[model samples]
Target: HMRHVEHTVTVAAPADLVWEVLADVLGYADIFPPTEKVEILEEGQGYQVVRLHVDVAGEINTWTSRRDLDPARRVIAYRQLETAPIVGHMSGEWRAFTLDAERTQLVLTHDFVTRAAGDDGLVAGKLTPDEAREMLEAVVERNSVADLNAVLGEAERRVRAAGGVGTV
Candidate 1:
């Protein structure tokens, strides 16, 4: 019916830097494991619009979302504007905080509602509550870990390229 998933990773970078990295909508295609396509409609001034394609249940689903970012607070929030099959919608927020003078911790949380009544069935007979939950959790957990690692690698590359030593 409804499900919530959360993931947190500590990145050894400033909150602002982490936010900078996270704010790049196009970069998500490189780091986000489940993301198939990402498009940014507008940048700067007001809320930014984004189109995203995510693979789930062996199918590719697309949704457009709006992003609100606060670099000073190292926080970013996204909410979908469209609904898709199984997934009623997806919402997420990410925050970064300093763990030390030279390191920062990043936390990301996602809450999604997947129902089978849309294009599937009214009773979700093909996928039970447990099955839906397990599917959501599995995808969230695995993709979160993969995305964190991918982002870490990208962050390190950026740091090195900028003539700064990378830490984790």
Candidate 2:
């Protein structure tokens, strides 16, 4: 079975600026706090193969993702080609919609499923299936919220910086 969840945040800046921040996968380490590092394994045309080290709760886990960037539509669809022990599948997208010339809505989503229990009687050799789901949900929610807030902050900050009124 698979589960889906999407979270959204509105930014005061234009969709162009919001998409600028959203599309910069290489800058994710600074933009998304839970992400500690990102490495580009390969890229061509509208896609990229990226490896990331991210924090879940307190543990650092690694994954390789394939991202398809649709610049004209301001969407980045991504799926983890490699995942942690408890994750059976994980994929999602980041979309930016134009609310107006000065406003934008950013949405982040995840579709995922937990791995089934193994011969060891544990989902990931440690946690039960229920526990695994709970853990994945919590991590997704926490990071999605934080990442949205950060993009909002960065986009608005950029607009302000470009507005030519120096901060006092």
Instruction: Report, for every candidate in turn, its global Cα lDDT versus the true structure.
Output: 0.72, 0.90
lDDT of 2 at 1: 85
Specify the poorest-scoring 10-residue window by lDDT in model 2.
159-168
Count backbone clashes in candidate 2. 0
Model 1 regions lying over 4 Å from their true place: 42-46, 57-59, 116-126, 164-168
lDDT per residue (tens digit) for residues 1-168 in model 1: 456767777776556666677888788887777788999887786468888888765778777888898776677888888755445567888777888765677777778876655355442556655566567677667766777766666666676677766688
Per-residue error at 26 for model 1, in Å? Answer: 2.3
**Which sections of candidate 2 miss by over 4 Å?**
166-168
Which predicted model would earn the best TM-score?
2
In lDDT terms, how accurate is model 2? 0.90
